[PDB]
Amino acid sequence: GSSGSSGDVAVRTLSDVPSAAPQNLSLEVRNSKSIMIHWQPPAPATQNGQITGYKIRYRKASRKSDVTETLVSGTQLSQLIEGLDRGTEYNFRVAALTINGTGPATDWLSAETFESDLDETRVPEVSGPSSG
């Protein structure tokens, strides 16, 4: 057989402001006018200080210039953004904030609301035991 691959990425920059953002970012669309935001806190090692809050900003796929500012609590890992329209794409982003100032922002995640009020249901799966 055979194979071949390579890769290496890192950074050696220091500063007062934090250079780490929340992971596991998700957008649980609650309604055609509202959207639930679920994000997880960054690693501790990176955390250059205690978090005071997050800055959730979003814009319209048609109007990027138009952005909305939203500040939540520090111990808040979820925010509900209401005031949207049905059948319309919207970009959301979450950023961490600390006493040092502001932090990085999460990629631009686009979410399309529900053309109407339709609730979907899902079913779980089977799980087998084990030993060791």
Side-chain angles (χ1 to χ4, degrees), residues 10-11 17 27 84 112 128:
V11 170
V17 277
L27 312 178
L84 311 154
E112 202 197 66

Side-chain angles (χ1 to χ4, degrees), residues 36-98:
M36 193 90 255
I37 322 188
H38 291 290
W39 68 93
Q40 289 32 80
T46 55
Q47 277 163 13
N48 296 347
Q50 68 195 335
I51 294 159
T52 53
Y54 297 76
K55 210 151 210 84
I56 287 164
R57 277 205 160 182
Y58 51 115
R59 49 200 195 179
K60 275 168 164 191
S62 279
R63 199 82 275 157
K64 271 87 170 275
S65 199
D66 269 23
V67 204
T68 303
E69 178 283 329
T70 309
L71 185 62
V72 302
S73 273
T75 188
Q76 182 152 323
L77 298 173
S78 48
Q79 166 52 9
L80 184 66
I81 300 292
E82 315 151 56
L84 311 154
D85 301 44
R86 53 154 174 184
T88 302
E89 179 175 281
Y90 286 100
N91 277 226
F92 297 80
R93 68 156 204 71
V94 181
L97 310 150
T98 64

Side-chain angles (χ1 to χ4, degrees), residues 99-117:
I99 184 166
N100 313 121
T102 47
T106 62
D107 193 32
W108 279 122
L109 209 60
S110 64
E112 202 197 66
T113 38
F114 309 120
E115 275 180 290
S116 195
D117 41 270

